[PDB]
Design a protein around this ligand. Structure first.
Ligand code: ADP
Ligand code: ADP
Ligand code: CL
Ligand code: ZN
Ligand code: ZN
Lengths: 69, 69
């Protein structure tokens, strides 16, 4: 089943690349209708980046959650 | 740059999972407007599957080619 290839990929994509900033925590994310938005940082490091004034790691990658578009 | 995280992922996704049927050739694919469609089989095994009457591996996974949806 093709939807499961996509789901297992997202599961892996999410797991093997932690927060770009602290490198250990997993990334923040949310579901935005038909896509999964994976933010570049965990929530702790994102808030911290505002405080310290660094917007270098700000960003996200959206992933279609289904196999067919 | 976020578009590049998506591109490098697709590059990897495409490379580490060859044809589901013969297991060596890389998969067929095409660009369908804003998505990359990765078919489950290379072209040789897909045509062959019609000939032998097996539709078990028929299918594809579409991937949004950009970071933002
Ligand atoms: N945890 C995070 N790590 C990195 N960047 C983030 C994080 N949370 C938000 N951002 C960035 O801040 C902005 C807010 O995004 P978001 O709230 O998803 O947009 P929208 O409100 O349109 O859904 C975007 O640039 C997003 O990439
Ligand atoms: N190389 C291949 N491997 C596996 N399945 C395939 C392959 N080529 C086509 N198919 C399947 O046959 C059908 C034809 O798909 P496609 O021509 O992409 O649709 P469309 O013409 O709407 O763009 C779909 O079920 C597709 O998944
Ligand atoms: Cl996707
Ligand atoms: Zn972090
Ligand atoms: Zn093959």
């Amino acid at each position: 089943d093709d939807d499961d290839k996509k789901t297992n990929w997202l599961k892996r994509i999410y797991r093997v690349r932690p927060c770009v900033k602290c490198k250990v925590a997993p990334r923040n994310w949310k579901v935005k209708n038909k896509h999964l938005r994976i933010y570049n940082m965990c929530k702790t490091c994102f808030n911290n980046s505002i405080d310290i004034g660094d917007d270098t790691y700000h960003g996200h990658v959206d992933w279609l959650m289904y196999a067919d578009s």
